[PDB]
Write a protein that binds this ligand. Structure first.
Ligand SMILES: NS(=O)(=O)c1ccc(C(=O)NCc2cccc(F)c2F)cc1
Ligand SMILES: [Hg+2]
Ligand SMILES: [Zn+2]
Length: 258
């Protein structure tokens, strides 16, 4: 039926309706730190999120997305392995039912409690729709979340989760500053990949940050109270909405640090 993360419609079944699931540049992948190549030609990332305009937060049945106004160059990602300007359109997370799992990407097989994805599209393509038809159409900034001290900047997100508990629900979510979700260091690993959820399009340049951000146990607990189901349907907790690591195949993971 429609794709999900359950036993009968999960990642292992996606290939039936989306053959690209078994493609050549699928994400996420395991990042082997000893095989990753330090590339001195990689420029530092340039995250310019000061003019960011968040609009709303929505439970889409797979995760919750915080959407941004991308009609202009308000919040952009440049530099790093990218050529051109990429506009922030939305961010979301993937998390587990327990603290020891939840991230999509892993580092030396280590799984983190969750993973934040800041989605950006290449402006030379005009709109998000055209960008997903190009090999360099998207750039997703990935950040790992480990359970420890609370992250102040994530609280506004946590507090609003009650209003979007079920699939289809949305709430206004203006003036959110995404800079509060960034770690201190912008060191990263980068490799060409895909969306981690159907349609699994291979249009993404992944930029995974080395330094994870820490959030509290209470903060992550709030994520786990969301529902995959719509209002009135039987309750299915939204947990474990992550895709397991895929074969790296003919790709090399480059590091911006040594
Ligand atoms: N987890 S992740 O960062 O890799 C990821 C990022 C974006 C999307 C997305 O935009 N999906 C909807 C979608 C996809 C293609 C075309 C569309 F029109 C559309 F709405 C999905 C997964
Ligand atoms: Hg593509
Ligand atoms: Zn994602």
């Amino acid at each position: 039926h429609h794709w999900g993360y359950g036993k009968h419609n999960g990642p292992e079944h996606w290939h039936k309706d989306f053959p690209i699931a078994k493609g050549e540049r699928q994400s996420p992948v395991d990042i082997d730190t000893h095989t990753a190549k330090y590339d001195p030609s990689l420029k530092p990332l340039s995250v310019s999120y000061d003019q960011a305009t968040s609009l709303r937060i929505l439970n889409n049945g797979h995760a919750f997305n915080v959407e941004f106004d991308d009609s202009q160059d308000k919040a952009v990602l440049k530099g790093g392995p990218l050529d051109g300007t990429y506009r922030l359109i939305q961010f979301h997370f993937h998390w587990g039912s327990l603290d020891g799992q939840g991230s999509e990407h892993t580092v030396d097989k280590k799984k983190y409690a969750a993973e934040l994805h800041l989605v950006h599209w290449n402006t030379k393509y005009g709109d998000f729709g055209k960008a997903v038809q190009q090999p360099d159409g998207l750039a997703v900034l990935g950040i790992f979340l480990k359970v420890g001290s609370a992250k102040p900047g994530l609280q506004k997100v946590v507090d609003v989760l009650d209003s979007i508990k079920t699939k289809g629900k949305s709430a206004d979510f203006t003036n959110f500053d995404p800079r509060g979700l960034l770690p201190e260091s912008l060191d990263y690993w980068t490799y060409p990949g895909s969306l981690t959820t159907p349609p699994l399009l291979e249009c993404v340049t992944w930029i995974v940050l080395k330094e994870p951000i820490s959030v509290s146990s209470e903060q992550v607990l709030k994520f786990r109270k969301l529902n995959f189901n719509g209002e009135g349907e039987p309750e299915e907790l939204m947990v474990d909405n992550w895709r397991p690591a895929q074969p790296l195949k003919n790709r090399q993971i480059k590091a911006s640090f040594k």
